[PDB]
Amino acid sequence: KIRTLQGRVVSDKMEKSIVVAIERFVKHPIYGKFIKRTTKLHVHDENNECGIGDVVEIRECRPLSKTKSWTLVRVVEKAV
Amino acid sequence: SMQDPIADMLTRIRNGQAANKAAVTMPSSKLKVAIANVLKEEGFIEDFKVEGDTKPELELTLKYFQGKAVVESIQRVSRPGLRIYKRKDELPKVMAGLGIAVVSTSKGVMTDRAARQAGLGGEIICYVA
């Protein structure tokens, strides 16, 4: 498939689009401590098949809109 | 301790060496037993024994050659908050190879020499010298 970064759906308020935050563990460039860092990505899904709090797997595709270049392929878990 | 048990074990060993004690006790754990095995292999302690069933109490038997103790310097390297992971060719040599550096690799808790020979590195635990 693709890199298939996995994140957590932060907010689902737009129409046919969601916001997903991925996680990253990176060492500090000079102090050597493993800081937690997140990145936000607009993800586009047509069926509205997720909920706020889920964990999804997003892959990269052609740019669909301004600051929206990811698509949802599968939802792993549910809200609760 | 409450947030780092390995530092508590090392502090107990160091204080026992300071006060000329003969045996120290502490709550046991698999990692502590592995560290005690590594210490007794290189020869920094006489022996060690574990007792109990539901709340074990690991007990060492500190050994001193002469009036001066054997374990003269021991510290915690990768303390919780500053985790340290070193590769194969970056493994440290304490006291120009006269001491040991207890590392934790994918095979088991072993000294730095065995890890350098086998060809793999991992999380450093403590410097013993």
């Binding site: 500090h28 102090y31 401590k33 800081i35 | 908050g81 500053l82």
Partner: protein, 121 residues
């Protein structure tokens, strides 16, 4: 400090203040010598002084000690200040090279000659 206190707020550097803030990275500057003084020093010393007062081409006006053993500076002559703050009298943190624009090398010098505009005999 704790590693977190440095991750959040890093180790700030120590800013440096230049001793001569009118040269602005220039080993020489041209003056006009607006006035000449002979004011007294502050620490116990056996002299009055030999100083001047020039207006640099970049607007700043700074004092400038005059070394040697006798000068020929006027109120409309141009000088070439270099640096080298003078300790005794406060407020003077420059010098005046000799034999550059309108100054002259003090006479009879035969040791440490190149420091003044004195040619070889």
């Amino acid at each position: 400090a704790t590693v977190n206190q440095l991750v959040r707020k890093p180790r700030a550097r120590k800013v440096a203040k230049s001793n001569v803030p009118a040269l602005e990275a220039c080993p020489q500057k041209r003056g006009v010598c607006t006035r000449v003084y002979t004011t007294t020093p502050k620490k116990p010393n056996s002299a009055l002084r030999k100083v001047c007062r020039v207006r640099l081409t970049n607007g700043f006006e700074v004092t400038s000690y005059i070394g040697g053993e006798g000068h020929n500076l006027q109120e409309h002559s141009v000088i070439l200040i270099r640096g080298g703050r003078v300790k005794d009298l406060p407020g003077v943190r420059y010098h005046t090279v000799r034999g550059a624009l309108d100054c002259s090398g003090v006479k009879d010098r035969k040791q440490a000659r190149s420091k003044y505009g004195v040619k070889r005999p």
